[PDB]
Design a protein around this ligand. Structure first.
Ligand SMILES: CCCCCCCCCCCCCCCCCC(=O)OC[C@H](COP(=O)(O)OCCN)OC(=O)CCCCCCCCCCCCCCCCC
Ligand SMILES: CCCCCCCCCCCCCCCCCC(=O)OC[C@H](COP(=O)(O)OCCN)OC(=O)CCCCCCCCCCCCCCCCC
Ligand SMILES: CCCCCCCCCCCCCCCCCC(=O)OC[C@H](COP(=O)(O)OCCN)OC(=O)CCCCCCCCCCCCCCCCC
Ligand SMILES: CCCCCCCCCCCCCCCCCCCC
Ligand SMILES: CCCCCCCCCCCCCCCCCCCC
Ligand SMILES: CCCCCCCCCCCCCCCCCCCC
Lengths: 314, 102, 478, 162, 100, 299
């Protein structure tokens, strides 16, 4: 069984498995780091006793949530109730699945790329919809209608925000996107695309300030699945933002993984800072900002990007 | 090529391991531990606007990957497309279709 | 193939009506004004109608890998634009009594007119499909415009469900045709077959599925059951538009498709279309014998007249005046349906609420409305094939076309259906004069439109030579 | 390549068959979404990558979301639907199923008599689709935008609450 | 190496299944669902036909097909919401006011 | 002539009237049967809700829905219910369901001595403390004919103003948190900890000092109170400006708060509204100036 083809296949499989394991542990440790960073922002310490520096708090949470009594409501649909955390985890996980972390270190070098990210987000809205329906509660139903309306109102321009980087790269591939950032990172030309993608990625992750309850009927491992899927999705959006607007793994001196991890961790810290600082806007202004402002901004940005590209092509 | 079939195997392993990992943690959560309003039409309007603008967005998705090959003629065609889309959006905004509170 | 300035000036009615749609939408978004929006709509449609003359100056050519502009496109674009202008003119007094928003009606009429112009200019399967749906969806809006009324909502639901099913059938048929052929151009549907294997099973089945879809769209038997209910439930200007513009545009694109496709010469398709036309004439004439409602009777009339049109369609590959006969018949049928449904709309205007009935009560119309009764009986005699009417000239053209191609079964069907149509049309025209027990210039404009249609039918029935010369001048590309 | 096509086609057929014979609207829409995912897998196995991408982005990401939105808006608890079982009585479904089966055999006989060298499965990228879309199909794009606008206007006019 | 006939057979099977669901179901919602299945099957047939010939025409016609499908689904759901608002039921056989 | 004279403090299925002299003040024996049946009415209250019981009319037209916020709110203002008549998201009728926090403080006042009732006066407004103790001991001193010396007046004014600053800081923090910004409540609770340090030094307790007495205060001021007061007075204004610039000048908070539930002088006068609302209606009425007490004229 000694052959270079089988060795390469096993090595690529191990690389994908390593990427997935690092992502799930990074999401869980980022929930712990969200707690710690909220403590740091709010002039306190946070969890720092369970193990060295609180690093074993996540293990305690996992053990508690595994050994808690699993509950499914008596008057609820079992399949949909079980299937909502499945979507909330796996949809944005496989949205991460296209992100290139290093040259030669990728899971799938697809020809669609952030198109596949859009498929995964459109699948991810079903988690909120299914959790609202399967709870058999009208309060959670109305909350899910509101949350799904918000996520639709911002997914309506998520892809059009990514279209500026698509136009400047000329292809849907992520490797071509990070190769086109060899001189100037995409945050400089596609700045409006950058802010609109930031707002859209914040909104579709059900995070501050675009949130709300449909979580009340879940408990035990299903609530933990929703939680870790939310943080894994924040990791996914941060890494996609790094690979789309900040060159990804490209850097002058450090190894490419060091630059990619530094930019990703900076965007996670910026997520926690956004949660700590900004207040909650009301529904009407949130939907008005999603529709009236960001979508025409993305359309005008795409038009200006096309005009600049065709002007620069002699 | 060896690289492409290796990449397909890696993607298949990623999908299978992710789905099976979430299923396994669901099974473990189920296994461990002992035991003891009328909705308005504004949601429909918002979802329908999302659907229509998502199809116009898919047209723009198709255009954006081939801007250089289409030339200035494709830019003109997409300009009329985006102008019609923005006229529709302005029409929706000005009649109160996108306003939640009356 | 790219677009030239010559291709742009050949695109003038499409661009003008689209710019009218954008301008009307921006006017609605600025301030809801019924009069201003209707004026902008009719000015845009008239601008397209007069830019047809510049299109005729530009000549006949192929504008797209999709569209082709020639005299065929000129004639059918003019018919569709005239139908849309008459629809707006009849729609304003009906919309004067509407409590809800009125400006969306003209937007939908403009978009449906755009779809009709695209169907007139269509030289592609994609363009044919897009024109069919661009006609259908505004008709979904207009049929159920008065959705509070039960009849209009029911007609909208029936039309939407059945047209979605027929669009699925038509798209599956185009998919089978494209799988057989490999090119979606009209001329290339059968160019890859020779030496007597034109009757390929996949191509025949695909063309049969689009025949099903178009026979729904043309109220052909046995896809005709929607016609009286949708005609009755919809508003009367919507009934006018659905009777004239949609049928004219779809039959024009069917004419162009069957003329340009080499598989239209195949005998099995011609025999199937002969059976469809025979059954359509017989059924649409027999089913209107005992109708007390003018809208259902006019729907069965539309079924029978489209059967006569299909009879003229069958001899397209044999005769030489078959498309000329179709043009003359379609002009006469446009004017006949315009006059009849305009009289119906002027009696049904303004909209007197959704809870009140829209009953016609045509008995004794002469004793309070003499001019409208005269117009209505003129159009009733025109639809019967009675002489000194344009409908008689169209019926004579259909009869000559059927005589040329030895389609004697279809000719006997035309004679029998003409007798039955004579019975019910004369019953309506004589019920107008029995005994039974406005105030704005838009209503006067609608009355002027129906009076001009009646006078045009009378003059071109007495003297049909200018219309024949105009239709012969609309020569398509061989 | 062909393995994925056959498995996804069988999954889509089974899911649609469970769609048309189900009483729960949400379960029917879930099986419909599963069939859409399988049909997009069929698309990806045939090289039409843009077709599958738009199948899950739009067909399984906008249209089915709208259907689930409407279903949960109505709060359909199967009133006079779950308690009827009308489509499962053989006197109702034997006729239409026989008719659809007859049409299926006719279409299959038509399909089996065409030239077929097979599908090579070469991936047609979205770049070529966008080149053809804004090249030889400009009027298709503009009038499709017009059609989407018309559908939006009609659905706004009909689905208002007042 | 996949035959075109097998893809066309799959599309035909899905089309007649959607039509059967459109016919035998008295609910308007399941009728719209069956309509969605039929138009998706037609789009699948167009994609298979386009990929057999190696052309982008199939994908372009699919794009037009799903634009129509999205618009038609929106229209039918608006009409369904109007029917459920003004009649409190989705019985398609009970809405038969005009006939003959 | 009352539109709806139902019980507001006790539940509707309560026998007798508690503030009558023949009613026993002390707690009756507990029964799980009463609790279980009351759980049954708590279960069927959503199903058997009749708007005519609560004074609402034309309930369920069928364009109105009934919303119950309580009984437990996720806030520090207490636990209570509000039933709302709704058209979509618009409130047309609403009545609050109160009495979930009834402690019988008046009935307790009839069974405690004049001296032993002061800790009960603490827990009337539990963010007030000495502010709640002051009117009771002032009225008892009016009964006793006691004129307190000046040092007593200034000490009571000091503690009342300290607890007023504590309550105002907690109120501003909870309003900011209810808007959506959860950060400044931590810093303002640190400021409340500074106030609590001074109050612990003076009275020996944090929240309910029970330190005011009939005729004075329980102890003299501890040696070193002025140091803690000086550090607190130096600490406060920078933190106040920081909270202002962080949240009360934010445009999102202004959009959430400006123009919401506005009333004029007539509405405040006819409904007995006092304090911040009455002065926000333009009426200058503070008891510390109009009818001065505890030597407030010397400040
Ligand atoms: C709870 C579970 C529910 C069901 C979940 C899914 C079940 C199936 C799991 C096993 C899948 C096995 C692997 C399938 C093949 C993966 C590789 C692949 O698709 O390769 C084809 C193509 C390659 O692209 P490229 O390299 O660019 O090609 C150039 C030259 N070939 O690449 C592509 O075409 C890429 C695009 C297709 C990728 C599909 C990914 C999965 C989509 C479904 C997600 C479902 C999410 C959960 C449920 C949502 C609610 C229903
Ligand atoms: C195993 C028994 C059944 C077990 C339960 C069901 C599990 C899911 C089964 C369906 C999905 C997986 C099917 C198997 C895919 C395996 C990978 C494969 O066949 O790849 C081939 C090809 C790779 O790309 P290509 O460049 O064409 O490669 C040619 C090789 N030179 O691939 C392609 O070109 C595209 C590959 C397909 C598209 C991506 C994956 C789509 C997945 C859709 C899932 C739908 C929901 C299924 C739900 C099942 C449970 C209800
Ligand atoms: C990897 C992806 C994530 C990347 C992380 C880093 C970026 C995070 C981006 C977060 C974006 C949050 C956007 C919040 C939008 C809120 C819009 C809204 O509803 O505003 C309402 C408010 C009042 O509006 P009005 O209708 O006038 O109400 C007055 C009525 N009396 O209106 C106003 O007060 C006016 C201002 C509205 C908001 C403008 C945008 C502010 C965005 C937040 C600040 C970002 C600063 C830069 C952060 C670092 C970026 C690198
Ligand atoms: C938030 C970061 C998530 C990363 C997910 C993927 C992890 C893959 C690990 C790859 C390790 C080797 C990287 C290439 C070698 C060069 C760099 C070596 C030092 C890190
Ligand atoms: C043959 C083509 C049509 C020619 C014109 C037909 C008649 C049109 C209407 C003219 C006006 C008719 C007035 C009839 C009055 C009858 C009064 C009867 C009194 C007992
Ligand atoms: C109901 C209409 C009946 C029409 C009968 C027409 C019969 C025509 C026979 C033609 C025979 C041609 C033989 C060659």
């Amino acid at each position: 069984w000694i052959s270079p083809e089988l060795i390469e296949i096993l090595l690529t499989i191990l690389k994908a498995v390593v990427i997935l394991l690092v992502v799930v542990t990074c999401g869980a440790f980022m929930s712990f780091g969200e707690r710690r960073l909220l403590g740091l922002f709010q002039n306190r310490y946070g969890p720092n006793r369970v193990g060295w520096g609180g690093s074993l708090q996540l293990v305690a949470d996992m053990i508690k949530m595994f050994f808690k009594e699993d509950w499914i409501p008596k008057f609820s649909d079992r399949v949909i109730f079980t299937l909502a955390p499945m979507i909330a985890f796996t949809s944005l996980l496989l949205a991460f699945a296209i992100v290139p972390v290093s040259p030669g270190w990728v899971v799938a070098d697809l020809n669609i790329g952030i198109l596949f990210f859009l498929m995964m987000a459109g699948l991810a809205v079903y988690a909120v919809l299914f959790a609202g329906w399967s709870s058999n509660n009208k309060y959670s139903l109305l909350g899910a209608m509101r949350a799904s309306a918000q996520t639709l109102s911002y997914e309506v321009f998520l892809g059009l925000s990514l279209m500026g980087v698509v136009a400047q790269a000329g292809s849907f591939n992520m490797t071509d996107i990070v190769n086109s950032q060899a001189h100037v990172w995409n945050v400089i030309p596609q700045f409006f695309g950058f802010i609109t993608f930031a707002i859209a990625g914040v909104a579709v992750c059900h995070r501050h300030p675009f949130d709300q309850g449909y979580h009340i009927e879940y408990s035990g491992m299903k609530f933990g699945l929703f939680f870790v899927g939310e943080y894994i999705g924040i990791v996914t959006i941060s890494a996609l933002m790094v690979t789309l607007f900040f060159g990804g793994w490209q850097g002058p001196l450090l190894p490419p993984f060091i630059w990619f991890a530094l930019k990703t961790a900076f965007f996670m810290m910026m997520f926690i800072l956004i949660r700590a600082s900004l207040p909650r806007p009301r529904y009407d202004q949130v939907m008005s900002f999603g529709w009236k402002i960001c979508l025409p901004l993305t359309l005008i940005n795409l038009l200006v990007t096309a005009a600049v590209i065709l002007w620069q092509a002699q | 090529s060896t690289e492409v079939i290796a990449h397909h195997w890696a993607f298949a392993i990623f999908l299978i391991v992710a789905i099976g990992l979430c299923c396994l943690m669901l099974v473990g959560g189920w296994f461990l531990g002992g035991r003891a309003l009328r909705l308005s039409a504004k949601f429909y309007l918002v979802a329908m606007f999302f659907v229509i603008f998502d199809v116009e967005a898919l047209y723009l998705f198709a255009w954006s990957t081939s801007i250089r090959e289409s030339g200035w003629v494709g830019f003109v065609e997409a300009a009329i497309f985006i102008f019609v889309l923005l006229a529709g959006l302005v029409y929706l905004v000005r009649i109160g279709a996108l306003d939640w509170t009356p | 193939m790219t677009i030239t300035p010559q291709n742009l000036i050949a695109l003038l009615p499409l661009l003008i009506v689209g710019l009218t749609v954008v301008v009307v939408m921006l006017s609605i978004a600025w301030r809801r004004n019924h009069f201003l929006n209707a004026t902008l709509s009719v000015i845009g449609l008239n601008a397209a109608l007069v830019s047809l003359w510049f299109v005729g100056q530009a000549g006949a050519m192929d504008v797209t890998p999709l569209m082709r502009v020639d005299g065929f496109a000129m004639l059918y674009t003019g018919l569709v634009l005239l139908a849309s202008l008459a629809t707006c003119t009849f729609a304003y007094p009906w919309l004067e009594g509407y409590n809800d928003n009125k400006d969306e009606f003209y937007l939908l009429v403009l978009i449906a007119a755009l779809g009709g112009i695209l169907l007139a200019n269509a030289n592609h399967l994609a363009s044919l499909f897009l024109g069919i749906e661009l006609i259908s969806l505004p008709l979904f809006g207009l049929v159920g415009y008065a959705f509070r009324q039960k009849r209009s909502l029911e007609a909208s639901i029936k039309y939407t469900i059945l047209s979605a099913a027929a669009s699925s059938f038509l798209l599956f048929g185009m998919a089978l045709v494209y799988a057989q052929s490999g090119d979606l151009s009209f001329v290339a549907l059968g160019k890859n077959l020779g030496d007597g294997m034109l009757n390929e099973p996949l191509l025949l089945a695909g063309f049969g599925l689009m025949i099903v879809g178009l026979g729904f769209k043309l109220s052909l038997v046995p896809f005709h059951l929607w016609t009286p209910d949708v005609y009755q439930g919809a508003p009367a200007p919507v009934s006018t538009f659905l009777a004239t513009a949609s049928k004219i545009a779809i039959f024009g694109v069917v004419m162009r498709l069957f003329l340009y496709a080499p598989v239209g010469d195949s005998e099995a398709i011609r025999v199937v279309l002969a059976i469809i036309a025979f059954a359509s004439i017989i059924f649409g004439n027999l089913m209107a014998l005992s109708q007390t409602n003018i809208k259902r009777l006019l729907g069965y009339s539309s079924i029978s007249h489209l059967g006569y049109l299909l009879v003229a369609l069958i001899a397209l590959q044999t005769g030489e005046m078959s498309m000329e006969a179709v043009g003359v018949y379609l002009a006469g049928y446009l004017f006949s349906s315009l006059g009849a449904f305009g009289v119906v709309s002027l009696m049904s205007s303004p909209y007197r609420g959704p809870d009140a009935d829209s009953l016609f009560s045509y008995r004794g119309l002469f004793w309070h409305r003499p001019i409208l009764a005269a117009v209505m009986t003129v159009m009733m005699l025109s639809l019967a094939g009675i002489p000194m009417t344009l409908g008689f000239i169209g019926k004579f053209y259909v009869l000559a076309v059927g005589v040329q191609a030895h389609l004697w079964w279809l000719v006997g069907a035309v004679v029998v259906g003409s007798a039955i149509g004579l019975y019910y049309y004369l019953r309506v025209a004589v019920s107008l004069y029995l005994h039974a027990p406005p105030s704005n210039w838009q209503y006067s404009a609608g009355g002027i439109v129906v009076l001009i249609s009646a006078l045009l039918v009378l003059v071109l029935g007495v003297w049909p030579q200018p219309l024949i010369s105009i239709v012969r001048l609309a020569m398509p590309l061989m | 390549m062909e393995f994925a096509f056959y498995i996804c086609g069988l999954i889509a057929i089974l899911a649609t068959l469970r769609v048309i014979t189900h009483t729960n609207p949400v379960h029917a829409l879930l099986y419909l979404i599963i069939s859409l995912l399988a049909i997009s897998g069929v698309f990806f196995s045939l090289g039409a990558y843009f077709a599958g991408a738009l199948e899950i982005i739009v067909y399984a990401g906008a249209i089915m979301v709208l259907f689930v939105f409407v279903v949960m808006m109505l709060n359909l608890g199967g009133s006079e639907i779950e308690q009827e079982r009308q489509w499962l009585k053989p006197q109702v479904w034997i006729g239409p199923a026989i008719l659809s089966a007859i049409m299926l055999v006719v279409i299959v006989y038509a399909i089996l008599g065409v030239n077929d060298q097979g599908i090579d499965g070469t991936p047609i990228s979205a770049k070529a689709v966008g080149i053809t879309l804004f090249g030889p199909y400009v009027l298709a794009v503009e009038l499709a935008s017009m059609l989407l606008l018309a559908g939006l206007v009609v659905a706004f006019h009909v689905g208002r609450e007042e | 190496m996949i035959p075109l006939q097998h893809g066309l057979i799959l599309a035909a099977i899905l089309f007649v299944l959607g039509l059967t669901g459109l016919v035998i179901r008295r609910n308007l919602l399941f009728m719209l669902i069956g309509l969605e299945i039929m138009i998706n099957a037609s789009a699948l047939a167009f994609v298979v036909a386009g990929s057999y010939w190696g052309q982008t025409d199939g994908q372009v016609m699919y794009i037009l097909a799903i634009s129509l499908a999205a618009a038609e689904a929106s229209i039918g759901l608006a009409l369904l919401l109007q029917l459920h608002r003004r009649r409190q039921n989705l019985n398609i056989d009970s809405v038969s006011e005009m006939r003959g | 002539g009352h539109p709806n004279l139902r019980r507001i403090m006790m539940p509707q299925t309560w026998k007798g009237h508690p503030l009558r002299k023949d009613y026993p003040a002390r707690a009756t024996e507990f029964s799980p049967f009463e609790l279980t049946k009351a759980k049954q009415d708590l279960e069927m209250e959503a199903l058997t809700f009749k708007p005519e019981e609560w004074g609402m009319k034309r309930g369920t037209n069928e364009d109105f829905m009934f919303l119950n916020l309580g009984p437990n709110h996720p806030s520090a203002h207490g636990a209570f219910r509000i039933v709302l008549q709704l058209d979509g998201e618009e409130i047309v009728d609403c009545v609050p369901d109160i009495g979930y926090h009834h402690r019988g403080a008046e009935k307790m006042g009839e069974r405690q001595s004049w001296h032993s009732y002061i800790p009960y006066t603490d827990r009337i407004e539990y963010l007030g403390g000495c502010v709640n103790e002051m009117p009771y001991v002032l009225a008892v001193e009016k009964l006793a004919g006691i004129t307190v010396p000046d040092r007593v007046n200034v000490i009571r004014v000091m503690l009342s103003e300290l607890f007023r600053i504590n309550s105002h800081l907690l109120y501003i923090s909870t309003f900011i948190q209810d808007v959506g910004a959860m950060t400044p409540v931590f810093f303002a609770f640190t400021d409340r900890q500074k106030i609590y340090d001074l109050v612990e030094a003076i009275t020996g307790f944090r929240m309910h000092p029970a330190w005011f007495r009939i005729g004075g205060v329980a102890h003299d001021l501890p040696r070193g109170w002025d140091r803690l007061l000086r550090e607190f007075l130096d600490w406060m204004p920078k933190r106040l400006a920081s909270y202002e610039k962080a949240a009360l000048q934010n445009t999102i908070l202004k959009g959430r708060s400006q123009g919401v539930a506005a009333y004029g002088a007539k509405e405040a006068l006819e409904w007995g509204t006092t304090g911040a609302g009455l002065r926000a209606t333009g009426i200058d009425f503070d008891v510390r100036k109009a009818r001065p007490y505890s030597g407030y004229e010397n400040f």
